[PDB]
Paper text:
Herein, a type of exolytic heparinases (exoHepases) is identified from the genomes of different bacteria. These exoHepases share almost no homology with known Hepases and prefer to digest HP rather than HS chains by sequentially releasing unsaturated disaccharides from their reducing ends. The structure of BIexoHep consists of three domains: an N-terminal small β-sheet domain (Ala24–Asn150) composed of a large loop and a five-stranded β-sheet (β1–β5), a central (α/α)5 barrel domain (Pro151–Glu515) containing 20 α-helices (α1–α20) to form an (α/α)5 incomplete toroid structure, and a C-terminal β-sandwich domain (Leu516–Pro864) containing 23 β-strands and 5 short α-helices that fold into a three-layered β-sheet sandwich structure (α21–α25 and β6–β28). Further structural studies have shown that the active center of the exolytic Hepase is an L-shaped semiopen tunnel with a positively charged entrance and a negatively charged exit, which precisely controls the sequential cleavage of highly negatively charged HP.
Furthermore, a crystal of an inactive BIexoHep-Y390A/H555A mutant with an unsaturated HP tetrasaccharide substrate was obtained, and the structure was solved at a resolution of 1.73 Å by molecular replacement with Phaser using the complex structure of BIexoHep with the product as a template. In the crystal structures, each asymmetric unit consists of one BIexoHep monomer, an unsaturated disaccharide (ΔUA2S1-4GlcNS6S) or tetrasaccharide (ΔUA1-4GlcNS6S1-4IdoA2S1-4GlcNS6S), and two Ca2+ ions that were confirmed by inductively coupled plasma-mass spectrometry (ICP-MS) analysis. Notably, the BIexoHep complex with the disaccharide product and the structure with the tetrasaccharide substrate do not show significant differences (the root-mean-square deviation (r.m.s.d.) between the two structures was 0.140 Å based on 786 atoms). According to the hydrogen-bonding networks, a series of residues, such as Asp70, Ser226, Arg230, Arg233, Arg332, Asn336, His337, Gln340, Tyr390, Ser554, His555, Arg579, Arg648, Lys755, and Arg757, participate in the binding of the disaccharide product (ΔUA2S1-4GlcNS6S) and the tetrasaccharide substrate (ΔUA1-4GlcNS6S1-4IdoA2S1-4GlcNS6S). The reducing end sugar rings of the tetrasaccharide substrate at the +1 and +2 subsites are tightly hugged by the side chains of the residues in the positively charged section of the L-shaped tunnel via a hydrogen bond network. In contrast, the nonreducing end sugar rings at subsites −1 and −2 have fewer direct interactions with the residue sidechains because the “+” subsites are deeply buried in the tunnel, while the “−” subsites are exposed to the environment. The residues His337, Tyr390 and His555 match well with three key residues His202, Tyr257 and His406 in the active center of Hepase II from P. heprinus DSM 2366, indicating that they may also play key roles in the catalytic mechanism of BIexoHep.
Residue numbers in the entry: 24 to 864
Amino acid sequence: AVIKVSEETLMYEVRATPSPADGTYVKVNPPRFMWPDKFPHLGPVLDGVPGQVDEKPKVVYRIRISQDKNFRKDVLTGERAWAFFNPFQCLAQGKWYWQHAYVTPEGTEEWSPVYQFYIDKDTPEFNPPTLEKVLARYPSHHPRVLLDADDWENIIAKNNNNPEARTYMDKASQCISRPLKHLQEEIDTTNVVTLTNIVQRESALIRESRKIVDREEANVEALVRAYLLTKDEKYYREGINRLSEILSWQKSKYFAGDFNLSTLLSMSTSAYDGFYNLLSPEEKQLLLDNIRKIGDKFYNEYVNHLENRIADNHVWQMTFRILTMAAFATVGEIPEASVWTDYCYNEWISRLPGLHKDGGWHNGDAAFHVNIRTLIEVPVFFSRISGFNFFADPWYNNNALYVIYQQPPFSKSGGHGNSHEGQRSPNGGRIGYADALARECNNPWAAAYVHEIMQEDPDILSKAFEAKPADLTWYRCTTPKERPAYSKHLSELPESKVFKQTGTALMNTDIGHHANNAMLSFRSSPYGSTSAALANQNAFNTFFGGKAIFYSSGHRTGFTDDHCMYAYRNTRAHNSILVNGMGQKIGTEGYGWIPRYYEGEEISYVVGDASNAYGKVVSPLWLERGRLSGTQFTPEKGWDENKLEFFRRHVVQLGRSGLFVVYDELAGKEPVEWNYLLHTVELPMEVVKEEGGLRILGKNKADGISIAHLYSSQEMTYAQTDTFFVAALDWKKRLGKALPNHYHFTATTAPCNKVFFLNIIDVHGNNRADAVINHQGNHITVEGWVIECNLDSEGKAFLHIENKQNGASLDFNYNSNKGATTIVDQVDGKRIEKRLVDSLP
Ligand SMILES: O=C(O)C1=C[C@H](O)[C@@H](O)[C@H](O[C@H]2[C@H](O)[C@@H](NS(=O)(=O)O)[C@@H](O[C@H]3[C@H](O)[C@@H](OS(=O)(=O)O)[C@H](O[C@H]4[C@H](O)[C@@H](NS(=O)(=O)O)[C@@H](O)O[C@@H]4COS(=O)(=O)O)O[C@H]3C(=O)O)O[C@@H]2COS(=O)(=O)O)O1
Ligand SMILES: [Ca+2]
Ligand SMILES: [Ca+2]
C-alpha cells in the first residue's frame, strides 16, 4: 500500500516526454499532442540577466495519428513549426497509435517511437473549432478586439448609467494637456546606482522603470476606454500624445525588462484597434511599426521554448495574452500576424489555462493574481469570436475551489509562493476574478464568495490592488452576462480540500464564518521549489479567524538574493524538518507529493512524502542562477549529501474542534540529528517542558493561538532565535520600512537512524479556552479523542485516533492494514469506511 518513488524529478523544467503519455487513457477528446523539442531549450534564466543561452534553430515537425498501427488506414497528419498539435476533431473510441518527426534542414525525417493511447466511451469531449473557422468569420472592421464594432453603440448605451464606467473618463480627463516628461526625468535611479551585483542592479532598474511605465499605461488605457465609451475625440488626441511619448522611451538604457516591452505592444494594440478609424497615416504607421517589431520579438522568444517550459511566469502572467491580442488585432493586415494567431490559438488549446489540472496555482498565493486578466480575457475573447465556450475546460470550476480555500473571506492566504506573507485579505482583483468565474461558469461557490464578501465590504472592487494584471473593470463593462443569483452558502463547503496534483491541502473548522475559522494549510508538491514556489515540502501553517500563528518565516526581498535562498525559500524558514540542519534541494528535484488523503466531516486527513527532497542542489537552472547571483549551495548554508531515506508527515484534522494531529515517520541512511521547526511572525513563542515532551505556545497580536504539544521517540533539546540565518535586507526597496524580525523554534533530537514525532496542535482564539491534553493509560486523550501512536525508533510506525462519541476513527499501521490507512467517518448519519492506499500524481 506504500509506494516508493525513485525518480530524480517528477516534473521537468524543459519537456522530456511526450503527451499523451505512452499507453495511457487520455483525459480529453481530442488529445492534446505535445513532445520534446529536437533542441530542448531552457532559454534566459533571469529577466534582467540572461546567463548562458544556446542557439534556438527554427525547426519543422510532422505527426501522424491512426488506429492502424502501420499508418495507412485513416491517418491524421500535420506539420508544425513547433512541438504541439491539435487535431480539431473528436477521435473514435478504441486504441490509437502515433509518432512525431523532426525534419532536418535537408528534408530527412527523424521519427519517434510509435506511442499508444486509448479513448473510452467515458472520455470527455472538449473540441474547440479550427483557427480557419474562427478567422473565416472574423470581421475586418475595427474595433474588433477591445469590443466589436457591431456591439459598440449598445455598449455605450449600457454604460451611460454604469458608475464603474465613469472612472475611465475622470482618470483620462486629468491627463489632458497635463504633459508627460521623458523617462530619464521621471524615473528614480538613485537606488539602482548603489548596487554592485549585476543581478540586483538590473532587477532594481526593471522595478524602477516599471513604476513609470505602468503608471502611464493606466493613463493610456483609460484614455482608450474613455474614447470607446463616449466617442469624445479629446481622449483620442491625448491617448496618441501620451502613447507617442512612451514609445519614444523604447531605446532608453533605462527601459528594462520584458514587461515594459510587452506594455508597449499592449498599448499599441489598444490604440490601434480603438482609434483605428481616426488614425492619421503617420499615426497608423507608428502603431503598426511597433506591433510588427514587438510582436515578432515575443513570438521569436516563445517558439520552441514557451510550449515546453514547465511554466514561463512572465509569459503566462501577461505577455502571452498581449501577443494574442496584438495578433488578432492585426491578422489579415500584417503577414506576421498569421503565424502569431496560429501559435497563440493552438498553444492556449494545447495546455492552458494553468499547470496543475486540479485547479491549484503552481506558483502560490501572490503569483495567482498576476494571471487574473490572462485567465479571463483570453477565453472570453476566444469564446465570442468562435461561438465556442472555452470556459467548459474543467480547470475553471476546479480553480474556483482554489480561490476560496487558499484565501477564505477576510483571511490570510495559506502561505505558499514568493510574497505569500503580504496576502492578508482577498483583494478586489481576486473578487473580480471570482465574479467572472461565477458568470462564465455559473459556478455557485464563486458566486457565494463574491456575494458573502461584498455584503461585508460593498466597496471591495474599488479597494487597493495592483490593477495592471488583474483589473476586470473592462470585462464588467462589456460582458452581456449578469451575476448569478446567490444560491449556495460558503458554509455548505466541505471542511477540507486537497489538491493532489498541486500538492496542497486546506483544512477548516468554519470556512463559512471566517472569524470563527481554525485553519491549517499544507504542502508536499511535485513542483518542488523552482520558480516562485518555496522549499517547504511537508510544511504546515496555522490560522485562526483569518490571521496566522504558526507561519513560514522570512521576507520576499527578491528572487535569488541570499536572504531568499538561505532564509525565505530555504526549508529552515518553514514548519517542516531539517536533517543535520540541512534542507531541501532548490528546483524541481526538491519535490514532495500527496500519496493519500481523505476529505470528511468528523475527520479529514492528508499525507505528504518528502523522502527525496533533500540533498545537494543539482538543477541546472538554479545552479546558473546561483552562479550569477552569488549563491553558495554549500553545507555551511544548508545543503549537503543526502542522508534522508523516508519522510512522511500525516496530518489529521480532528473534526471541527480546532485540534490537528501531525505524526512524522523519519528514516535516515545513518544516525542523524533531526531538527523539528516551528516559526511565528509577530510574537515570540513560549516553551515549557510538558510531560515527556515540549509545549510550544504561539500567539499573534490579535486573538489567535496555536499550541504545539510535541513528543518524540528520542530525547530533544530546543532553542529559539529572533534572527534570520542572514539579514532580510531590502536592497531593492520593495518592502515597507520595519521588516519585523520573526521567531524560530528548533527542537533537535539525539542522533539516530530513525525517529517519530507526534505534534498535537490546538488552534483557537477567544472562542474557547486551551484544550487540556491528558496523558493516561499509556496513550493521550483530549476532548473525547483518544490518540495512540508509535514513538519507538525501533518499532513499526502506527497512528490510531478515535472519537467514540462522534463515530470517527483513523487507523494507520504496517500490520493489520499492510501500510494502509483505514478511515471511519459519519456523513449525514451514514457510517463511511475507507481504506486508503498510495497513488502517484
Ligand atoms: O506583494 C507582492 O510583491 C506582490 C503582490 C501582487 O499579487 C503581485 O501582483 C505583485 O507582483 C509584482 C511583484 O511585486 C514585483 N516585485 S518587484 O520587486 O520587481 O517590484 C514583480 O515581480 C516579478 C519580477 O519580475 C521579479 O521580482 S523579484 O526580482 O523577485 O523581486 C520576479 O521575476 C522573475 C520571474 O518570475 C522569472 N520567471 S521564471 O519562469 O521563473 O523563469 C524570471 O523571469 O526571472 C524573474 C527575475 O529576474 S530578475 O532577477 O529580476 O532579473 O518575480 C516576478 C513576480 O513575482 O511576479 O512583478 C510582479 C507583478 O507585477 S504587477 O505589479 O503588475 O502585478 O507581487
Ligand atoms: Ca505565475
Ligand atoms: Ca510554495
